[PDB]
């Protein structure tokens, strides 16, 4: 799309790159109301480094690697409910 960037890129798309709504579309949380609680508690990394500010825009080439850190309570209880908690690599 070349000249019709006048009409589509709006608030509902430029906020769709946000880490809470990308988290909710990745189904890592129930809703935004506790997705912001998780990524403010500092459980969620993207790439290699942890990210804490809940206004971050995950880019195109980083949406694939926005995953929970090792050694965290939510990763531990996820692997516990799936009952696959391979406890060699910390969790």
């Amino acid at each position: 799309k070349i000249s019709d960037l006048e009409n589509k890129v709006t608030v509902s798309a430029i906020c769709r790159r946000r880490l809470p709504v990308i988290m909710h579309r990745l189904k890592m949380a129930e809703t935004i109301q506790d997705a912001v609680k998780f990524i403010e508690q500092g459980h969620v990394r993207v790439g290699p480094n942890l990210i804490n500010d809940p206004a971050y825009l995950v880019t195109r080439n980083m949406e694939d690697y926005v995953t929970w850190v090792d050694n965290s309570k939510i990763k531990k209880t996820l692997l516990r409910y799936r009952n696959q908690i391979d406890d060699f690599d910390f969790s």
Binding site: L26, K27, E30, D34, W68, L78
Partner: peptide
């Protein structure tokens, strides 16, 4: 349901998965 299994997204979490 086979398509959702092939896209399972292995990092989903809710409050209901504690027991």
């Amino acid at each position: 349901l086979r398509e959702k299994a092939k896209e399972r997204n292995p990092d989903e979490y809710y409050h209901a998965m504690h027991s």
